[PDB]
Design a protein around this ligand. Structure first.
Ligand SMILES: *[C@@H]1O[C@H](CO)[C@@H](O[C@@H]2O[C@H](CO)[C@@H](O[C@@H]3O[C@H](CO)[C@@H](O)[C@H](O)[C@@H]3O)[C@H](O)[C@H]2NC(C)=O)[C@H](O)[C@H]1NC(C)=O
Ligand SMILES: *[C@@H]1O[C@H](CO)[C@@H](O[C@@H]2O[C@H](CO)[C@@H](O)[C@H](O)[C@H]2NC(C)=O)[C@H](O)[C@H]1NC(C)=O
Ligand SMILES: *[C@@H]1O[C@H](CO)[C@@H](O[C@@H]2O[C@H](CO)[C@@H](O)[C@H](O)[C@H]2NC(C)=O)[C@H](O)[C@H]1NC(C)=O
Lengths: 110, 49, 50
């Protein structure tokens, strides 16, 4: 998932999107993030190498728009973008009412 | 009361905000931080103890 | 509580709930409220005699 925000210092609003293989958790809670998640005022809550996943995030008029695409690829060179055309269908629109200047992705570990 | 009808000038109160011997700044009808860009015909100045 | 001091104009449909002291002067407030350190949230104290 991803963490979006301005300063991410628990003094301002910050969007959090987390996938745990059964649901998608989207929050604006201003709690601490530490540094990296590990695995084996909340004014908005929303609960829902062959693989390549493409996403587009934009934030206009207080609306966070996420476009997504999923595709199987087979690559020869190590970690190079494929030469082709794929159209990204819309995935979700959120009325979170924030502005975002910085972001950081979330990794899964042992 | 000495009504001083000051005219034909632009307000520049930011000196008083930048100096020690001026303490209070309260404004009603206009913002206390948005005083510099305002224009008036006759500002009525009064000063008392 | 109504906001009277903020740094910039807001983009449409946005939320500001930060209660930090507005930096009117060049001196940092550092959590101290005073003159040239204005608190943003103020109320007009609505009364039926208004
Ligand atoms: C959630 O938002 C509130 C404000 O929107 C943040 O401020 C804190 O809210 C609590 C709960 O009201 C305040 O505690 C008590 O408030 C009453 C007024 O009902 C007051 O009479 C008491 O003396 C006491 O202060 C608290 O003062 C207020 N401010 C601070 C700095 O804590 C709250 O922090 C937000 N919480 C989260 C987790 O984001
Ligand atoms: C968007 O949020 C930021 C909060 O970080 C607001 O302030 C900007 O912060 C960045 C990071 O320090 C500065 O580089 C900018 O100069 C700040 N903006 C201004 C106008 O000074 C920012 O104001 C917010 N955007 C809007 C439209 O309110
Ligand atoms: C993935 O996360 C979601 C939400 O974080 C979990 O959903 C829980 O669903 C039960 C079903 O009634 C609720 O009682 C819980 O309150 C929900 N959790 C939370 C934190 O609200 C879901 O179970 C998680 N899946 C896995 C496999 O961990």
């Amino acid at each position: 998932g991803w963490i979006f925000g301005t300063t991410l210092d628990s003094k301002t609003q910050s969007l959090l999107i987390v996938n745990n293989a059964t649901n998608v958790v989207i929050k604006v809670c201003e709690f601490q993030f530490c540094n990296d998640p590990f695995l084996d005022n909340c004014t908005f809550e929303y609960v829902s190498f062959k693989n390549l996943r493409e996403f587009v995030f934009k934030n206009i008029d207080g609306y966070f728009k996420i476009y997504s695409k999923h595709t199987p690829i087979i690559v020869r060179e190590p970690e190079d973008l494929p030469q082709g055309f794929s159209a990204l269908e819309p995935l979700v629109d959120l009325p979170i009412g924030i502005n975002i200047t910085r972001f950081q992705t979330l990794l899964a570990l042992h | 009361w000495n009504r001083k009808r000051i005219s034909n000038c632009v307000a520049d109160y930011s000196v008083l905000y930048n100096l020690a011997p001026f303490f209070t700044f309260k404004c009603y009808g206009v913002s206390p931080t948005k005083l510099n860009d305002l224009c008036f015909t006759n500002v009525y100045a009064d000063s008392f103890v | 509580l109504y906001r009277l001091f903020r740094k910039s104009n807001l983009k449409p449909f946005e939320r500001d709930i930060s209660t930090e002291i507005y930096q009117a002067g060049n001196k940092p407030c550092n959590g101290v409220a005073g003159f040239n350190c204005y608190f943003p949230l103020r109320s007009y104290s609505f009364r039926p005699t208004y």
